[PDB]
Symmetry: C2
């Protein structure tokens, strides 16, 4: 648990359109919708041996390579599989929400995911009032920035991650100017299928 | 830790600093953790001392709740939230002074750390969210979104609250009043910058 430097893969995912959709239901319905979604995301992370760092509203943060050790290649394979499984889950959820009148009659929820691999100080951070296991550093900052920079319903990863992805699966490449980073970052949108 | 999601009038506080990453690039692993913990310690102590609830940390950002899980009058929620925000800002200045003396800031031109805080009071669904596999206690809804947006809209080293919060603050303690259009918000919001001092 004690914080230490380690090569890990960070995954950030978020949905946009949840608030708008929930705007019609009462508290109970809002909670049911969100729990439905968070449960699916958690399942996608656990099934691929990932660590659920935390939820941030309707955003999710997962780690691969901590606390349990994991090779860099397996971290990426698992992180990618999680992102693709999350998209499938959202496709299922959206189908249910549309047949429910929550979407279509309010557009379908959209998904964005960013994945980066790099060094990060990982372990328990906080105080006596509150301590949580997480990852800190530019690598984490970058993964979050990728998630916010990618287009609707897509997965964006860094070059460090893409090097383990079959070439034919990289749909689009583009250098992006990310906040706090001087050197433009080569990003790769990967095929959400396989 | 057992609370099922329920609607409730609460006060949400979001605070965040800028300059940690920059300041920490000039240090090493163990130093990062100790530096982050030093700051987080000051922040949580400010929340705890004011009987607030620390919801979570989001990197170096802090989220605190007043009125949940334990009940709290709407006026006490604001008093404690306001006192919390002010104490955090004072602690940050104390921290910057120490970091300055240690050469962590004001050297290799790493500006001193900047603090921002947003506070809003309104209805929110509070309780455990997630699934049997993983769930955490937090607050959800437009009211929470607004508090987050107020913190990101206010200027460096300042505290910004909504009209719902201001109504409990002595008028002379309100530095500035202005309408700002927050994201996803149809009706512009009345923002009030509070004096960092009582
Ligand atoms: N429970 C929670 N804990 C921490 N932050 C929360 C939160 N609920 C909401 N927020 C914060 O409130 C802000 C919401 O603004 P946005 O991210 O722009 C909403 P959106 O992604 O555009 O659509 P959405 O509301 O359907 O998800 C974010 O900064 C988010 O992290
Ligand atoms: N441990 C963590 N958990 C969740 N999100 C994290 C995180 N560490 C970093 N992030 C995310 O990474 C992004 C960092 O970008 P910014 O918020 O713009 C940093 P900043 O506030 O400008 O300066 P700073 O790095 O000194 O804090 C945010 O979206 C933040 O929420
Ligand atoms: Sr979102
Ligand atoms: Sr910050």
């Amino acid at each position: 648990m004690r914080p230490e430097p380690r090569l890990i893969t960070i995954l950030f995912s978020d949905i946009v359109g949840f608030t708008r959709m929930s705007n019609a239901l009462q508290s109970q319905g809002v909670a049911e919708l969100l729990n439905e979604y968070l449960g699916e995301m958690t399942r996608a992370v656990f099934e691929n041996q990932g660590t659920v760092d935390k939820f941030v509203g309707d955003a999710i943060m997962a780690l691969y390579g901590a606390p349990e050790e994991m090779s860099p290649s397996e971290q990426v394979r698992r992180a990618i599989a999680t992102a693709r499984q999350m998209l499938v889950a959202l496709e299922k959820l959206n189908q249910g929400w549309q047949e429910r009148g929550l979407v279509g009659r309010v557009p379908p929820v959209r998904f964005r995911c960013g994945i980066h691999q790099g060094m990060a100080v990982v372990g328990l951070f906080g105080s006596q009032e509150r301590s949580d296991f997480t990852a800190i550093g530019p690598s984490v900052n970058i993964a979050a920035r990728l998630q916010e920079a990618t287009a609707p319903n897509s997965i964006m990863v860094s070059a460090m991650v893409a090097q383990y992805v079959p070439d034919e699966e990289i749909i689009k490449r583009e250098f992006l100017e990310l906040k706090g980073i001087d050197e433009p970052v080569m990003t790769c949108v990967i095929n959400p299928n396989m």
